[PDB]
């Protein structure tokens, strides 16, 4: 995207919130809308229990995903100014 390394976005809708199996990639993927350009791209939350911190209409930083749905390119790094792995590790509370 763009010319930058990380993009910001709005979480439009957590697609695959009603998927059955817990660590499905359709369960982990989230449709976000990038601020700078306006397009809706899909991004992976790194973990299914870590999906619960991503709420609707939250400013979300996302980066590339460099390594079950092959081709979803982005991963959610920060949510509302706090790092998502820190939220998952219970280091910080999310400012809303």
């Amino acid at each position: 995207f763009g010319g930058s390394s990380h993009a910001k976005g709005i979480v439009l809708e957590k697609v695959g919130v009603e998927a059955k199996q817990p660590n499905s990639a359709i369960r982990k993927c989230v449709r976000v809308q990038l601020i700078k350009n306006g397009k809706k791209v899909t991004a992976f939350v790194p973990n299914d229990g870590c999906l619960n911190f991503v709420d609707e209409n939250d400013e979300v930083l996302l980066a590339g995903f460099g390594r079950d749905i092959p081709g979803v390119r982005f991963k959610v790094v920060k949510v509302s100014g706090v790092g998502l792995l820190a939220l998952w590790k219970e280091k910080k509370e999310k400012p809303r």
Binding site: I35, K36, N37, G38, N52, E90
Partner: protein, 88 residues
């Protein structure tokens, strides 16, 4: 510049009101748009229990909030809860 376009649409709505109820005092400014924010105001509350007036201390302040139409109904709230990190 989708962010500034969205913020400009919000400011356009925030100009459309205060442009639309700037037309009459007794009808719009009093009855349509209520009692606008920032203005000092005196409230008369009827039916307060007398234990409040007997145990009124000036330290612990008074916060008046406005309930919505939905905030007076009762029912089963389904919530997403988690214990705190430092609660034993």
């Amino acid at each position: 510049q989708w962010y500034e376009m969205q913020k400009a649409m919000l400011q356009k709505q925030l100009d459309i009101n205060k442009a639309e109820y700037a037309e009459l005092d007794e009808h719009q400014r009093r009855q349509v748009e209520g009692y606008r924010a920032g203005k000092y105001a005196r409230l008369v509350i009827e039916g307060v229990p007398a234990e409040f007036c007997k145990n009124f201390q000036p330290r612990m302040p008074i916060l008046v909030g406005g309930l919505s139409a939905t905030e007076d109904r009762f029912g089963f709230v389904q919530v997403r809860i988690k214990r705190h990190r430092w609660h034993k």
